[PDB]
Amino acid sequence: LCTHLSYSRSLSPGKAVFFYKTAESDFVPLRIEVAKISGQKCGYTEGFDANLKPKNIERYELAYSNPQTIEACYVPPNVDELYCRFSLRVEANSMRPYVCSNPDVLRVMIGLAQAYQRLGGYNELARRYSANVLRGIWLWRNQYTQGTKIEIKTSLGSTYHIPDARRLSWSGDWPELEQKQLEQLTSEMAKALSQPDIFWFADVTASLKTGFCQEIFPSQKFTERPDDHSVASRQLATVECSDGQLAACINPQKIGAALQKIDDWWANDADLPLRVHEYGANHEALTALRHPATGQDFYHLLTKAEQFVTVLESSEGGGVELPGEVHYLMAVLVKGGLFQKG
Amino acid sequence: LCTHLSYSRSLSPGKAVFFYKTAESDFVPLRIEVAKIPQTIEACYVPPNVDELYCRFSLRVEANSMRPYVCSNPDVLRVMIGLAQAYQRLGGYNELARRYSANVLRGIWLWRNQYTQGTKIEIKTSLGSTYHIPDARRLSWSGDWPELEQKQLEQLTSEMAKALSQPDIFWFADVTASLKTGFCQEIFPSQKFTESRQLATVECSDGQLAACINPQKIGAALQKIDDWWANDADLPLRVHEYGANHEALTALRHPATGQDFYHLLTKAEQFVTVLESSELPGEVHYLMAVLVKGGLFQKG
RNA sequence: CCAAGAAAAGGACUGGAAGAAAUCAUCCAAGUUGGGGACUAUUUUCUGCCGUAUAGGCAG
Numbered sequence: 001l002c003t004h005l006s007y008s009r010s011l012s013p014g015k016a017v018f019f020y021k022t023a024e025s026d027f028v029p030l031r032i033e034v035a036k037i038s039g040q041k042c043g044y045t046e047g048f049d050a051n052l053k054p055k056n057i058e059r060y061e062l063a064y065s066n067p068q069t070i071e072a073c074y075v076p077p078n079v080d081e082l083y084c085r086f087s088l089r090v091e092a093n094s095m096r097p098y099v100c101s102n103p104d105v106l107r108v109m110i111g112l113a114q115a116y117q118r119l120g121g122y123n124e125l126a127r128r129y130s131a132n133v134l135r136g137i138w139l140w141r142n143q144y145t146q147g148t149k150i151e152i153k154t155s156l157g158s159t160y161h162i163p164d165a166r167r168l169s170w171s172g173d174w175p176e177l178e179q180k181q182l183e184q185l186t187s188e189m190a191k192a193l194s195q196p197d198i199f200w201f202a203d204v205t206a207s208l209k210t211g212f213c214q215e216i217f218p219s220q221k222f223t224e225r226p227d228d229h230s231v232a233s234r235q236l237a238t239v240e241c242s243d244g245q246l247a248a249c250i251n252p253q254k255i256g257a258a259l260q261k262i263d264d265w266w267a268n269d270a271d272l273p274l275r276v277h278e279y280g281a282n283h284e285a286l287t288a289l290r291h292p293a294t295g296q297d298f299y300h301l302l303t304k305a306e307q308f309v310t311v312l313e314s315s316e317g318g319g320v321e322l323p324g325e326v327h328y329l330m331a332v333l334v335k336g337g338l339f340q341k342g
Numbered sequence: 343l344c345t346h347l348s349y350s351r352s353l354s355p356g357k358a359v360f361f362y363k364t365a366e367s368d369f370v371p372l373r374i375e376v377a378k379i380p381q382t383i384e385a386c387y388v389p390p391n392v393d394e395l396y397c398r399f400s401l402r403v404e405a406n407s408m409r410p411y412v413c414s415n416p417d418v419l420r421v422m423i424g425l426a427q428a429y430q431r432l433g434g435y436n437e438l439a440r441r442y443s444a445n446v447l448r449g450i451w452l453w454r455n456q457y458t459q460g461t462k463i464e465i466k467t468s469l470g471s472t473y474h475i476p477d478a479r480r481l482s483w484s485g486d487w488p489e490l491e492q493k494q495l496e497q498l499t500s501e502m503a504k505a506l507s508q509p510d511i512f513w514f515a516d517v518t519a520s521l522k523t524g525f526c527q528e529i530f531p532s533q534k535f536t537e538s539r540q541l542a543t544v545e546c547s548d549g550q551l552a553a554c555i556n557p558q559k560i561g562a563a564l565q566k567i568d569d570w571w572a573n574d575a576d577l578p579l580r581v582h583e584y585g586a587n588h589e590a591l592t593a594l595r596h597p598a599t600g601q602d603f604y605h606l607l608t609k610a611e612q613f614v615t616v617l618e619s620s621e622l623p624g625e626v627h628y629l630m631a632v633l634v635k636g637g638l639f640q641k642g
Numbered sequence: 643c644c645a646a647g648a649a650a651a652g653g654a655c656u657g658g659a660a661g662a663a664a665u666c667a668u669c670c671a672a673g674u675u676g677g678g679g680a681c682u683a684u685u686u687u688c689u690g691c692c693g694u695a696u697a698g699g700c701a702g
Contacts, residue, residue, distance in 0.1 A: 006670090006671050006672085009671085009672065009673095036535045036537075037558070037681095038679075038680060038681060039679040039680095040586075040678075040679050041586075042583045042584065042637070042678080043640075043678085046584075047584065047597045047602075048597065048604070051604075051642070054598060059592050059593050060591045062584055062593050063586050063587065063588055063591045063592060065679090065680080065681085067681090074356065074357065076544070076546065077359060077369075077546055077547065077552070078546065078547050098671060099670085144404070144512065145512075146514060167510075211356055211400035211402065211514060212398065212399065212400040212516070213357050213359070213399075213400065213544075214356050214400065214402075219674090221675080223675090229537075251674080253673060253674065254674055257673090258674085275674080283674080284412065285416075335672075335673090336672065337672035338671060338672065348676085348678090349677080349678090350677065350678085351677090351678070390696085411676090411677065412677075453680095454682095532681085533681050534681080535681050536681090558679060558680065561679085562680045563680085580680080588680080589683095635678075635679090636677075636678070637677070637678035637679080638678065
């Protein structure tokens with residue numbers, strides 16, 4: 001490697017905002033409320049010292065409540081449906097290093113991205129990204145509706161429509177006349193990723209049919225603990241409207257983390273996909289699947305580029321010849337960052 | 343045990359709103375009057391000429407106690423998974439579903455407002471069922487329910503037993519009750535917690551305010567089905583890791599007895615072994631009930 | 643019961659004049675804060691007559 005090497009971010013959303021319509025006004029934001037509640041005195045160390053001596057606490061001393069201040073958000077009475085919207089731009093920006101201080105590293109990385117493009121493979125990545133948009137997984141914990149309808153528009157004049165996204169799996173065979181739209185959307189994106197000077201925008205709107213006063217789950221703030229007993233212990237993220245009203249939202253990178261959740265190339269057993277990560281981090285299990293000790297991480301693989309190009313050149317393409325290691329590497333170059341200090 | 347372990351909630355309501363009908367419009371809110379006297383006084387009662395008051399809320403149930411939300415230990419995880427399934431296949435979800443279902447049909451979530459001239463409860467679900475309790479004033483915790491009512495308890499138990507145990511079923515219920523009332527009967531909505539007192543309301547889409555009962559106040563009523571201690575059923579407690587009893591200011595499963603959640607959590611290896619030899623004992627019923635009301639189980 | 647004992651440093655005074663700190667410039671690239679929850683209790687505010695009246699005035 002070398003002293004300077006970096007790629008920029010080739011695929012990205014802006015943020016998502018929740019709102020609803022009225023008969024008199026087209027845009028009314030969903031907003032949050034603040035309240036004091038009475039909690040439970042419970043859990044370990046409420047009553048134990050190192051699971052050894054149970055603490056001295058007299059019986060009556062645990063019947064007391066534990067008050068807390070929290071923010072919360074609910075849909076108001078008599079609204080028929082809730083809307084959520086965001087925009088997405090895609091750039092063909094993995095073809096060339098943003099910065100590179102080594103002429104030989106540069107010509108190789110260029111040779112590789114091109115060797116890959118002409119054998120196919122952007123179609124593979126585009127199919128996986130497209131599936132994640134149409135499925136609706138970017139709603140995170142708000143997917144549990146009575147019916148979810150998703151509509152997509154693009155700058156090239158296309159429109160896509162999924163009447164009900166509640167049941168499309170990662171692995172399986174999609175219903176007819178939906179399988180078809182996945183192919184069409186894949187084609188627009190596969191192009192957007194590899195041809196320069198196309199300004200491609202998508203506009204994604206979804207509708208959520210909900211319960212009478214169903215709770216909504218927007219992004220939380222990462223905060224320090226207050227000690228004035230007035231500031232909430234749990235705070236939610238909002239945006240300002242042009243007229244000063246506040247609205248609940250989902251953060252840009254929170255939408256992004258969902259869209260790029262594509263990686264089932266490890267251990268030769270697909271399971272569930274991981275968020276692309278140089279070390280294969282798995283948050284739910286608090287572990288890592290491509291620990292440097294295995295030889296399967298990004299940095300080990302980054303140093304074999306000369307060998308991969310040689311293989312790709314001997315292949316024909318248009319088939320299933322590309323190995324898991326080449327796909328992994330391309331996925332990381334798409335989520336660009338700093339790859340330095342050789 | 344281990345450092346990180348969490349479950350999320352598997353059963354939850356939204357909030358309850360009070361309203362009445364007119365000949366001119368179907369939803370007119372019950373409102374609250376305030377005099378500034380800051381330090382205020384306020385009141386709420388059914389106004390003249392309204393014969394009955396309506397109360398409504400929604401409920402979602404999710405099969406979410408089958409797997410840890412977070413677990414940092416592969417051996418703790420293997421066991422908790424084996425246990426939930428060892429239990430599921432012997433039944434027992436029926437028992438929990440029976441207990442939850444009984445409370446909805448009885449109507450105790452109305453708290454202090456149960457004293458009517460006749461309360462009727464109607465339930466609709468996302469699978470196309472409808473249930474009807476013509477009069478909720480006569481159903482006890484313990485006793486045999488009258489005919490045609492015992493039957494609906496079984497039918498509702500079955501739908502919920504599934505909602506709690508099999509994934510990818512999206513099960514919603516919509517619960518409305520009618521309170522036949524007195525001449526100008528006083529109504530008791532949730533109070534505001536402050537550092538005189540104030541009452542809680544919600545905003546309507548048209549700007550009017552309405553009286554309500556908080557989500558967790560409805561929830562606390564539904565989950566009150568713990569009577570597995572001391573071989574004396576009495577009335578049930580709200581499920582709590584320490585068996586708290588607010589009325590008497592005490593605790594029934596005080597850690598000093600060895601009967602709390604945390605002592606029991608560490609015997610999972612032994613329970614699975616028994617289930618394999620299987621009868622379900624109070625000790626595993628308690629544990630399953632706590633996992634359903636999920637929370638933090640950490641710093642072992 | 644001290645290298646012991648005693649003690650008025652005072653009166654007067656002009657620092658001034660004059661000055662140019664200036665010319666040039668890319669801080670950039672990537673990122674999941676999350677899981678659970680009862681403000682009401684041993685409360686104090688009932689029962690009536692006049693007045694078209696949920697207005698306003700009154701006995702107990």
